Structure 1
């Protein structure tokens, strides 16, 4: 009952998609270093993951893991893949409980940062989530610098984001 609490005013931003998206180069471990707080994500710190590339599927078998805001270590197991309707940088997220949602790769260098936007417009409101993925678990690293730029130039205020803590406590098993 009601309107989910994360819906806010305004439609989703209309961000750009990375030009020639190479799933295969995008694979690997990516750490979440700044995210727009997202309710469907239980883990809130040490958030890290592995995007395994399949090629008969032409999609990723992503596993994400980290800690609770309380202190359990959770492990999520979804699928993420490009689709027939749009360019590969606009993929779809197929996780168990969560809504099919989009995964738009605004811009990436593959070797260093990836800026992901994900938001479904509802009428004149939106449920908007975003990520700043880096290949280093450095929360002040070059990813944030780079990506906060991209997001602003695309219409997603970087202020909307909070940092994911990566400290002594971290355990990257994913």
Structure 2
């Protein structure tokens, strides 16, 4: 919960949606809730229209699996790295902005929602193709956030250690 209008960081230049699909593991995020997933992964599959189906899955402490299915749609025709995502019929879409990705190793995703023009809440996820990233990559991605006035101090490391080999 923050003062002012939503930050509007630059997004990934020359973004190629065709190289984005497949499985991404969650490495770090701004937590959305104080409750509980590990081994967090999302599978993206690119459709005919440029819509992207998203299947998010996580393991809970008791070893059960929680899943949610959603769809990402480009918000506009100018900037292919600015999408919006919807997971439930009853939930308005949320921005899904790809700030940086090399398609083969990492992606930084940002989302911000206003609470009037005077306040906002924002979120960010560092994703990877593998279950871990070099500390210097994580640092470089957090620097993007910081340099755009997005706070990284509340970010948590997702447990990719107590997890199956997939």
Q: TM-score, normalised by structure 2?
A: 0.86
Which runs of 5 or more residues in structure 1 are unaligned?
A: 1-6
Distance 1:166 1:139, change over 3 A: farther
Q: Does residue 122 of structure 1 match 2:115? A: yes
Equivalent residues of 1:34, 1:139 under 8 A apart: no
Equivalent residues of 1:18, 1:106 under 8 A apart: yes
| Equivalent pairs, count | 164
Cross-structure match for 2:151: 157
Once residues 63 and 24 of structure 1 are traced to their aligned partners in structure 2, the CA distance between those partners, rounded to angstroms, is 17
Q: Does residue 109 of structure 1 match 2:102? A: yes
- SS across alignment from 2:139: helix
Q: Does residue 77 of structure 1 match 2:69? A: yes
Distance 1:166 1:92, change over 3 A: same
Task: Map 1:8-157 to 2 at 5 A.
Answer: 8-39=2-33, 44-54=37-47, 56-68=48-60, 72-84=64-76, 86-96=78-88, 97-123=90-116, 124-138=118-132, 143-157=137-151
Once residues 143 and 153 of structure 1 are traced to their aligned partners in structure 2, the CA distance between those partners, rounded to angstroms, is 15
Distance 1:107 1:122, change over 3 A: same
Distance 1:57 1:143, change over 3 A: farther
Equivalent residues of 1:132, 1:143 under 8 A apart: no
Cα deviation, 1:8-48, whole Å, max 9, x if unaligned, reads 43332121111111111011111111000013x97621111
Which runs of 5 or more residues in structure 2 are unaligned?
A: none
Distance 1:14 1:33, change over 3 A: same
Once residues 62 and 111 of structure 2 are traced to their aligned partners in structure 1, the CA distance between those partners, rounded to angstroms, is 26
